[PDB]
Amino acid sequence: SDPEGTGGFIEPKWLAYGEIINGRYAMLGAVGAIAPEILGKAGLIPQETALPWFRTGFIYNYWADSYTLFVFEMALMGFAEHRRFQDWAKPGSMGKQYFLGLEKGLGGSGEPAYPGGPFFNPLGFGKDEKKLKEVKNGRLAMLAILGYFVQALVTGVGPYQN
Amino acid sequence: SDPESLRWNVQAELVHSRWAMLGAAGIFIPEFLTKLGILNTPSWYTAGEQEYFTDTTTLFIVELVFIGWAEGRRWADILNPGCVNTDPIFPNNKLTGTDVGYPGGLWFDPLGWGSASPQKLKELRTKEIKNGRLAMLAVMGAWFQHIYTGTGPIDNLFAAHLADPHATIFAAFTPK
Amino acid sequence: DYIGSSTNLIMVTTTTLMLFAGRFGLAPSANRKATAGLKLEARESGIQTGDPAGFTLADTLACGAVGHIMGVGIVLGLKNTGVL
Amino acid sequence: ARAYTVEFGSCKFPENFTGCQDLAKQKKVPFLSDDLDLECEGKDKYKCGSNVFWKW
Amino acid sequence: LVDRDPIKTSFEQWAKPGHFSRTIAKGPDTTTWIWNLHADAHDFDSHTSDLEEISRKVFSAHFGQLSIIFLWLSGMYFHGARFSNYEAWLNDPTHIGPSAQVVWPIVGQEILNGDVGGGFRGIQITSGFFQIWRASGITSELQLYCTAIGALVFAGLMLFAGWFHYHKAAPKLAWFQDVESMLNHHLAGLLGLGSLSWARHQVHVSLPINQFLNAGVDPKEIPLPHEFILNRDLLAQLYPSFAEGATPFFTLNWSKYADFLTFRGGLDPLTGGLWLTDIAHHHLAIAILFLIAGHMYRIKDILEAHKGPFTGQGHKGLYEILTTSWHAQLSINLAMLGSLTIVVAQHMYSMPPYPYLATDYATQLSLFTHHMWIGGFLIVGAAAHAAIFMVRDYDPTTRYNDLLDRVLRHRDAIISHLNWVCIFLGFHSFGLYIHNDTMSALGRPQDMFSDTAIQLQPVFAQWIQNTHALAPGTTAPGATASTSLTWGGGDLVAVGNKVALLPIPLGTADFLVHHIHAFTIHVTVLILLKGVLFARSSRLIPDKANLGFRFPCDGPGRGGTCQVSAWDHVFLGLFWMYNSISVVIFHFSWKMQSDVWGTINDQGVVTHITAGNFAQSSITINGWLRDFLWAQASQVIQSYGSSLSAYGLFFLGAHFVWAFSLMFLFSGRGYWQELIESIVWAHNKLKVAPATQPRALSIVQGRAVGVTHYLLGGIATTWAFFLARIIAVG
Ligand code: CLA
């Protein structure tokens, strides 16, 4: 049958809750701070023709990790985002195993969310010691923050505050 | 919510597909088979050595006289006889329909069990790779573009140009 | 900063001039026309005390109170008050 | 193939390296070098105020 | 309808004769219903007796206009791009004479394609892109080629919002049937946030990128594709980066400035398109309002309020049903939208807003008559649709005893006056001219009405024009010249190719056209006014809202009983307005060229396209084909074998099509029947006709194929007559 797409007060919000969750670790720059020593800046159009920003950052933007094959990625691995969205509609058989061979008890996990198959290795608490939209809410309070920090300048002048 | 589209003659398009791409089967491996340098080089001075050419557009007649006979006398009597006039059995004729072809005629029939059936087993072969030809010569018939377009230097037409790294052609593989 | 810092506080001289003169002028509304200088509820004079307009429209002059001479024709005389 | 090996200087160390081609050091210490000069120093320490904005 | 309500098929209705009122298109065959179907296709007395949907259609089948205006414009930006002449013309204006369109040399074609400027074969333009396009804080041909697809972007999307309505299971009532906010929004931030946003991209980028164009260069010897960011360093030439100010207010010092704006008025010597140093300030000074303004408000309250003695008790309550009409809240609009378009048509020619207009004569009068026929074709409409109200829209009569029920109360009255108004005019407003002929052909000038014989004396001046160009000495601040250079007082020096605007003098031969307009504007309106007013009931027919606002004519009785209705008042009211506009046009160019347009050289001895021939000689209404029609038009009937030629070569057709209207306008109906059978007979003998009962035209269709033709005839006639006497000398 024809594919589906139910709107209803607030799908737009479940997938809109989700969009920012992904963008909260695609926040990247300060979540994984080792990520950019200077990688937040993409480094457009700085040909051995010419130039970057403008007075920039300048003591390209950069050395680089370049290239092409940028569309093929975001498309091809977007050709997976909509599969853990179909496959586990369910009727399970994913573990096609191998025709012969009884020696395949070996499992791996199950369906995972978190420390894996299950949680696991029961046995725990000594020390580590002394609601999950908050695990969302605070990372747009990390997202939209670099947002203005791209253009984060007064330039002609600077910190009035100071 | 969905198109009222399925042609009813949606049945025909598919045995029109057994045409286009089983036929295009005889293209993928004869072309990309080539033989690079078998020993090496083709030398074709034969029926074209010295008799003022051979074919080109006298090629078309000699090619498509018996291809005219072949393709022409194909869908016409794939099966359907009876063929007359008045009322509908729905595709846009089916004047054969309930009648197989001839009441008490001759050997209109191929094989036993009052049908044209060549038995039930043979779904194995011609379902996958043979209609794969459909979905293969889809993007591997759309390798057409990659193989030539970009017009190996000689020709740029209405010069906009607009970009320049390096050329594009065919041989297999790729930079990167 | 700059003189614009003593002007950062001058955001107050308009915005607080505006919004502090705000509520009263819309407070006992549902009124439209009318007041005391017309149709029935007389206690005359001009009077005395009733806010927004009076105080803050007088504060535009006020901002020019202590910064006066200051800037103006810069510093003169030997202590205008006589006290040491 | 300046920098098949962006090899350059000293090792080490004292100062303004960046030779000598390259140059200079332009504003040096933590700056530039960043590059990445290195290191971090009981400085200086950039942050504001100073450099004594030595201009002029 | 029928197949197959309701729950039970997807399966769409393709096949089974008819739909549209109920002994419908009947099984039994006919033709009339094929003009039916297209006509009245949009309408509402059928589709459903229930509002609901309709507003759910009109908010969609609306949409596909924007999207269209959007597929359009694209083929115009593309067109005004790679079919170039814009690059060529801009480094080289005063000089060029622009193109966008070009043939392909099939058959006769090519004659139409005739050297236009930056070195190429094509057909010209009187549609002032190449001049909005001055704008381009950037320049580049492939660039417009982005603005272009930027166009097709808005479209497909601003056209899948129309899928994303009606066809998608729709909003409802409240959504529009709560109106409470609508203009709140609209005027505040778009009306505002455009004009606003337009400010930001009207000094940022444009001002500077023609601040130093008005001199020379060849583009990209100027205005990069990014260049205009943070770099507030070239914004250095065209005022401060605020230097020491912070977000206007006052503790600011000017010992020498006052931000961009520094208000102009007049006209650039080198590009008299009016100054831009202003154009930001005025759009800024707009938006604010809208920005403040669109902040009413929530509705009755304000109209439920001020009444009086004779005034409008129903003023109070002036329509619950103004959230429940359309046909009403469309007709109102058209009068404004429409009447608010031809107010353009002036402020344009006596105040150009684009670089290179006036000098460009033909590329802003086309304008001033195109814009001019909408500020009229949209007004008769703005009446029609009120008639459409006045007849039907509401369910019952819930609306009562008010401003209207009032106006109607008098009605053989408001239109009783207005009438005499017109015959007072007409006699003072046309036979006025006819005097002249009868007495100048009699010939005794002593006694004409000349700008000089009947007492008026070498001055017009002392009125209000002369207190306009001279007002920069009131509460007025100032700024050299006026507001509109065409005013009485001071100044001359305007432009170095040809001319632009200068005073524009008056008296008589300006006095009386100005009056024919009155009488023409008035008797137009009489017929629409009385038309829409007497919409539903009367003492020629009271049983007279009983079908719709059309209906042919009630019937041979009562004497006449034919025209009546109000489709038809909106049929003979077009008939006039075609004049209303068609003679206002006739006015402007005969002025604007008899005086104004003309030309400088040494000692700027002015040399109008015509040494004011107007003078003593429009006053004669023959002079109007001595000096006009037979004078100019000699360019239409010389125009063969050329490049424009498509005008002379139209000017015969369309000067034919009109003279085909009369046949549709002037004739019976069971006539072409009585004829259509003789035909139908000869048809049957060979066995070749009956199926789909061939039928003559639907009494009022017939009038539909008058009128519409009479206009697309009688009009493009001049659309040709014009472009052929501004291209080529003028
Ligand atoms: C050229 C560019 C460069 C850039 C700019 C990007 C950019 C992007 N890539 Mg990517 N990629 C690159 C090179 C690049 N890639 C290369 C060279 C490869 C080959 C490996 C990939 C392989 C790759 C894959 C497989 C995917 C991406 C995805 C993405 C997108 C994911 C966004 C994200 O923040 O996920 C990471 C941010 C998070 C908050 C997720 C946290 C999850 C972590 C902990 C798992 C990995 C960390 C791990 C423990 C490290 C162990 C080592 C292990 C790699 C062997 C993003 C737009 C993803 C995507 O966008 O799919 C639709 C995914 O598809 N890339």
Ligand code: CLA
């Ligand atoms: C905001 C405005 C606008 C809108 C949305 C409407 C909407 C409507 N009008 Mg309306 N109208 C308008 C402005 C508008 N009008 C104006 C300005 C006028 C004054 C002329 C009118 C005069 C008018 C009348 C008299 C009628 C309507 C009617 C209607 C309704 C019928 C619609 C229909 O079937 O299309 C009609 C369009 C056609 C059938 C297409 C034929 C167009 C021909 C004449 C071509 C025009 C010439 C052109 C040059 C030809 C193309 C070029 C060619 C040479 C290649 C509909 C609700 C009708 C009704 O009965 O109400 C329910 C009634 O007929 N209108």
Ligand SMILES: CC(=CC=C/C(C)=C/C=C/C=C(C)/C=C/C=C(C)/C=C/C1=C(C)CCCC1(C)C)/C=C/C1=C(C)CCCC1(C)C
């Ligand atoms: C300049 C260059 C380059 C390159 C390279 C390249 C470079 C290539 C390209 C390719 C391309 C492709 C593959 C595609 C593309 C597309 C695009 C880029 C687009 C974009 C866009 C924009 C911009 C916006 C809108 C959207 C779009 C998408 C349209 C070069 C340079 C140089 C020098 C210095 C010297 C010599 C050497 C070299 C090294 C050479």
Ligand SMILES: CC(=CC=C/C(C)=C/C=C/C=C(C)/C=C/C=C(C)/C=C/C1=C(C)CCCC1(C)C)/C=C/C1=C(C)CCCC1(C)C
């Ligand atoms: C979304 C937007 C916007 C905008 C802006 C806009 C939204 C603008 C607009 C404007 C508009 C305009 C500007 C209009 C125009 C029009 C036209 C141009 C037309 C014309 C014409 C005429 C005259 C008539 C008819 C014909 C034609 C069409 C031609 C934004 C938003 C936002 C948000 C939320 C976030 C933050 C940022 C912001 C920004 C705050």
Ligand SMILES: CC(=CC=C/C(C)=C/C=C/C=C(C)\C=C\C=C(C)\C=C\C1=C(C)CCCC1(C)C)/C=C/C1=C(C)CCCC1(C)C
């Ligand atoms: C004879 C003819 C034609 C004529 C024609 C004529 C003799 C005329 C016509 C005309 C048309 C028209 C005319 C249309 C149109 C149009 C247009 C496009 C317009 C536009 C415009 C506008 C926009 C608005 C207003 C203004 C104007 C008009 C400009 C033809 C004939 C024929 C034959 C033999 C047979 C076959 C068919 C044919 C081939 C067909």
Ligand SMILES: CC1=C(C/C=C(\C)CCC[C@H](C)CCC[C@@H](C)CCCC(C)C)C(=O)c2ccccc2C1=O
């Ligand atoms: C001339 C005239 C006619 C006769 C006009 C007619 C019959 C015009 C209709 C002719 C149609 C449009 C011809 C349609 C035939 C073609 C569409 C069929 C072939 C299809 C094409 C391929 C040619 C009237 O019917 C009429 C009615 C009311 C008032 C005045 C008049 C009036 O003046």
Ligand SMILES: OC[C@H]1O[C@](CO)(O[C@H]2O[C@H](CO)[C@@H](O)[C@H](O)[C@H]2O)[C@@H](O)[C@@H]1O
């Ligand atoms: O093995 C990965 C590769 O990337 C590393 C991780 O190993 O880290 C940076 O370097 C790559 C280039 O290889 C960057 O694209 C990557 O995204 C960076 O984090 C580097 O050490 C390795 O070369």
